[PDB]
Design a protein around this nucleic acid. Structure first.
Ligand SMILES: [Mg+2]
Ligand SMILES: [Mg+2]
Ligand SMILES: [Mg+2]
Lengths: 63, 177, 49, 40, 46, 282
RNA sequence: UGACGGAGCCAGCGAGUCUAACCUUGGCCGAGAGGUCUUGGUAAAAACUCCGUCGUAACGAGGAAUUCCUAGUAAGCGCAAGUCAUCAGCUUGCGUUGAUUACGUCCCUGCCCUUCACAC
């Protein structure tokens, strides 16, 4: 890996974030990027619920 | 564990949830068993018994009923016979209903038998390779009738009543002490 | 007993085994557990010796 | 309901970026915690 | 995720409560105790 | 040997017992030394102890890595055997190879019907320094135990987020140079003990320009393990992951070889204590 | 290099007063709680050796590519335990039967190292 790494850098001046399958007849996804998004969306939803726990009013915008 | 939940999807929500038994043994919900539905696996700090009941402590919200019945005695004709919502006790009597009860919930006197545990059984492999100082003397039972065992005369009658009594007295004395 | 009502020092009665589970036997409480644990630890200690 | 233990941490992209930065800083400073041959 | 949030919140709440409880216990001991010693010294002087 | 190993362990345990008894006396001598330099008076108990004062004249003449490792710390390169549980799946066999490439001085051994007392005794004959056993679940590594010979400790770990290198396309081959080590956020006394165990699996004295770095980062008791290869650029450092990635959480640590199930427990993970969630030991 | 049946025969781990179903049909006693009986359905050492009999929609041993492996190893067989993490869609131990082929070479592919006599 390193010898390729020097080769790339001298021309210019992390393959573990991609899950790849076997071509039976290739990159399949993004575990790091997908999990971050799926984890944050439930975080803002959890943030929303804790705001809504103890409220009855709310600005009723019908515009 | 069984009968806590109804389907594996329910167990999914409560994985890792804290649990305990009646005895006080704490535990955790590990994972949901694929078969049968609802059954799950839990690991307890010490071995639990079948007779135990495993309990999960949860909290369910309760809401305050919005009931407002101002007393307006002056508007009435009598002014001293205002009557609003009746008590649960009175309501049941008017409808001829029993106070709900659960046979499980009632209390009863509990009598505990003295607890006793079996004697210790050393594995034979360990027992074989023991130092000479500490070798456990396990005296095997005899099955072939010994000749002396077929010879000895046991006094009957007057001695028998006079010997059972000795085993009677000494049993009282040790228990007294 | 200083500044304590006799109502505070009220006996809390102990529950019993459910009838649906009556076959299995007596419901183990904390006291009867402690006896089970102590005896087991006493025996294992001798084996380790 | 109560939970007994923290769930095992998840490896997000932000976590890797934080972990990478620590390693890069250590190498750049050239301090590593490694066993050193004893003299004599 | 809900498990992760709850334990962090519970631990933080437990941390603040102990600091607050220690805070009130210590300030009472420090200030009030000083006066009690001051009074006792005056009683000894009398 | 068997008589040799038994007596050596007995003396060592006896040395620990006396050292714990000697701990009080050591402090008593430290107080006397400070009193002489400062001129401060001694406490009452030390003043009336004539035996200590007479002993002090001889014991005035007195002055790190852990005891099991102190003998060979930085002298003799570790010898490592990496094995698995019985009838391993292919993935565990693949992962066991990756661990072998991780440690420069490791060798992979097949556990087909090897009995554990035979396995440890065989390794003790051959001078093996460390034995590593990996378990698996449906081709997913789950546990890792590191057993230092001749007399422990045995440290047990559980793996999460395991990502083997075979899961990568066109990864290439690894570099087997003696790699640099990074140990981050190990603070408590137990944490040093784990650093002490993990540090000594590697060969001492990497070259300053060695291009392989292994990092064990503790983050809430979950030791992240990463392997990187770096190229020093004119304006910083650029790194690339070689792998494998995985997270280790200690859950046992015994004063003995992994065979001895009766060995004393130096530390264990208590999960059902009420206050389990609050503190992180490592 | 089968099936069925019978016969002979060989292990090692493991010992918490602790070990383990569900859904029904009815009878009797009991103020109740419940107790007992009755009743149908559903679930839940092996290899080895000897003897006797028969008889040779999907799929019939798995393409390309890719991975692992050197002696009690590969592979086949069952038996236990579930030991604060992991595991029962399974994990870990235990014994039983036990081979072929290499144990040389730096030719290719990678990684690494180097540039106190006598004799050289
Ligand atoms: Mg095999
Ligand atoms: Mg098998
Ligand atoms: Mg297995």
């Amino acid at each position: 890996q390193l010898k390729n790494l020097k080769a790339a850098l001298k021309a210019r001046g992390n393959p573990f974030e991609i899950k790849a399958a076997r071509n039976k007849r290739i990159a399949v996804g993004k575990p790091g990027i997908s999990k971050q998004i799926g984890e944050e969306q439930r975080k803002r939803a959890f943030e929303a619920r804790k705001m809504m726990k103890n409220k009855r009013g709310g600005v009723i915008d019908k515009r | 564990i069984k009968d806590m939940f109804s389907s594996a999807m329910e167990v999914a929500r409560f994985e890792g949830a804290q649990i305990k038994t009646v005895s006080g043994i704490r535990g955790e919900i590990k994972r949901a068993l694929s078969k049968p539905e609802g059954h799950y696996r839990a690991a307890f700090e010490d071995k639990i018994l079948m007779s135990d009941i495993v309990i999960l402590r949860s909290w369910y919200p309760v809401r305050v009923k919005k009931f407002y019945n101002p007393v307006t005695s002056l508007l009435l004709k009598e002014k001293t016979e205002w009557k609003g919502l009746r008590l649960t006790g009175q309501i049941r009597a008017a409808m001829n209903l029993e106070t709900p009860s659960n046979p499980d919930s009632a209390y009863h006197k509990i009598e505990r038998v003295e607890r006793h545990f079996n004697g210790l059984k050393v594995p034979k492999a360990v027992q074989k390779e023991l130092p000479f100082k500490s070798q456990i003397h396990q005296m095997k039972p005899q099955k072939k009738k010994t000749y002396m065992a077929k010879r000895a005369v046991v006094l009957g009658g007057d001695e028998k009543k006079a010997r059972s009594f000795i085993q009677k007295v000494l049993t009282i004395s040790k228990a007294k002490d | 007993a200083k500044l304590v009502h006799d109502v505070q020092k009220k006996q809390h009665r102990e529950r019993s085994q459910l009838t649906s589970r009556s076959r299995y036997g007596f419901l183990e409480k904390h006291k009867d557990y402690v006896k089970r644990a102590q005896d087991f630890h006493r025996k294992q200690s001798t084996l380790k010796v | 309901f109560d939970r007994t233990a923290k769930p095992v941490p998840v490896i997000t992209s932000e976590v890797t970026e934080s972990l990478e930065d620590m390693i890069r800083r250590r190498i750049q400073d050239s301090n590593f915690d490694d066993l050193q041959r004893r003299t004599l | 995720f809900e498990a992760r949030q709850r334990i962090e919140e519970k631990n933080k709440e437990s941390s603040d409560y102990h600091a607050k409880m220690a805070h009130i216990v210590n300030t009472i001991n420090t200030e009030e105790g000083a006066e009690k010693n001051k009074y006792e010294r005056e009683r000894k002087l009398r | 040997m068997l008589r040799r190993q038994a007596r050596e362990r007995r003396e060592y345990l006896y040395r620990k017992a006396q050292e714990l008894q000697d701990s009080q006396l050591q402090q008593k001598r430290q107080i006397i030394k400070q009193a002489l330099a400062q001129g401060k008076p001694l406490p009452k108990e030390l003043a009336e102890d004539e035996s200590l004062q007479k002993d002090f004249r001889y014991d005035q003449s007195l002055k790190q890595v852990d005891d099991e490792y102190a003998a060979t710390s930085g002298i003799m390169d570790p010898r490592i055997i990496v094995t698995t549980s019985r009838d391993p799946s292919t993935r565990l066999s693949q992962f066991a190879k990756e661990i072998k490439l991780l440690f420069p001085n490791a060798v992979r051994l097949n556990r087909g019907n090897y009995v554990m007392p035979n396995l440890v005794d065989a390794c003790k004959k051959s001078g093996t320094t460390d034995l590593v056993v990996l378990h698996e679940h449906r081709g997913v590594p789950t546990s890792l135990t590191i057993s230092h010979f001749p007399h422990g400790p045995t440290a047990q770990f559980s793996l999460h987020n395991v990502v083997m290198r075979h899961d990568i396309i066109n990864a290439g081959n690894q570099s087997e140079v003696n790699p640099h080590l990074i140990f981050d956020n190990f603070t408590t006394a137990l944490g040093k003990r784990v650093v002490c165990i993990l540090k000594h699996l590697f060969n001492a004295g990497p070259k300053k320009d060695s291009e392989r770095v292994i990092t064990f980062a503790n983050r809430g008791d979950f030791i992240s393990v990463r392997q990187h290869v770096y190229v020093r650029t004119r304006e910083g450092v650029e790194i690339a992951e070689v792998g494998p990635r995985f997270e280790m959480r200690l859950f046992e640590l015994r004063l003995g070889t992994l065979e001895n199930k009766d060995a004393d427990v130096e530390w264990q993970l208590r999960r059902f204590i009420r206050t389990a969630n609050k503190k992180d030991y490592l």
